[PDB]
Amino acid sequence: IPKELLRAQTNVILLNVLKQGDNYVYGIIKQVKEASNGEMELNEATLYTIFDRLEQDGIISSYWGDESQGGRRKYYRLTEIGHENMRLAXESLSRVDKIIENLEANKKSEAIK
Numbered sequence: 001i002p003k004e005l006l007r008a009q010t011n012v013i014l015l016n017v018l019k020q021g022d023n024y025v026y027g028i029i030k031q032v033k034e035a036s037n038g039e040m041e042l043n044e045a046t047l048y049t050i051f052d053r054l055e056q057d058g059i060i061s062s063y064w065g066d067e068s069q070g071g072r073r074k075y076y077r078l079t080e081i082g083h084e085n086m087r088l089a090x091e092s093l094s095r096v097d098k099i100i101e102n103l104e105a106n107k108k109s110e111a112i113k
């Protein structure tokens with residue numbers, strides 16, 4: 001698996017766990033590891049550089065959690081701008097899907113001549 005396929009796959013996973021509920025980095029890492037049957041151990045440094053970019057892009061936002069629960073924990077949430085961009089990707093995949101289906105429908109139904 002090449003470098004940027006892994007980064008894309010990691011981005012798709014992080015945006016989906018936030019799509020389910022706000023979460024903190026250590027919690028995201030454990031939940032992904034147990035949702036991958038232990039195979040996928042995400043790294044904190046790469047998670048923060050992804051989030052730091054997604055913050056300036058307006059895709060996600062950050063806020064400080066409760067301090068009764070230990071002390072000082074940053075939670076991340078998928079914004080409305082992020083929810084809609086995921087919905088468009090959404091639309092775009094099922095749009096590409098039937099464009100491909102239409103290509104061989106049209107490919108063989110014309111190679112007949």
Ligand SMILES: C=CCC(Cc1c(C)n(C(=O)OC(C)(C)C)c2ccccc12)(C(=O)OC)C(=O)OC
Pocket residue numbers: 005008009010011012015082085086089090093
């Ligand atoms: C649901 C939205 C995720 C997405 C776009 C996206 C990427 C990059 N996919 C991808 O490469 O899947 C691999 C090949 C399995 C790794 C997708 C695969 C299926 C559906 C959407 C995507 C995103 O993560 O880009 C930031 C988006 O548009 O979110 C706003």
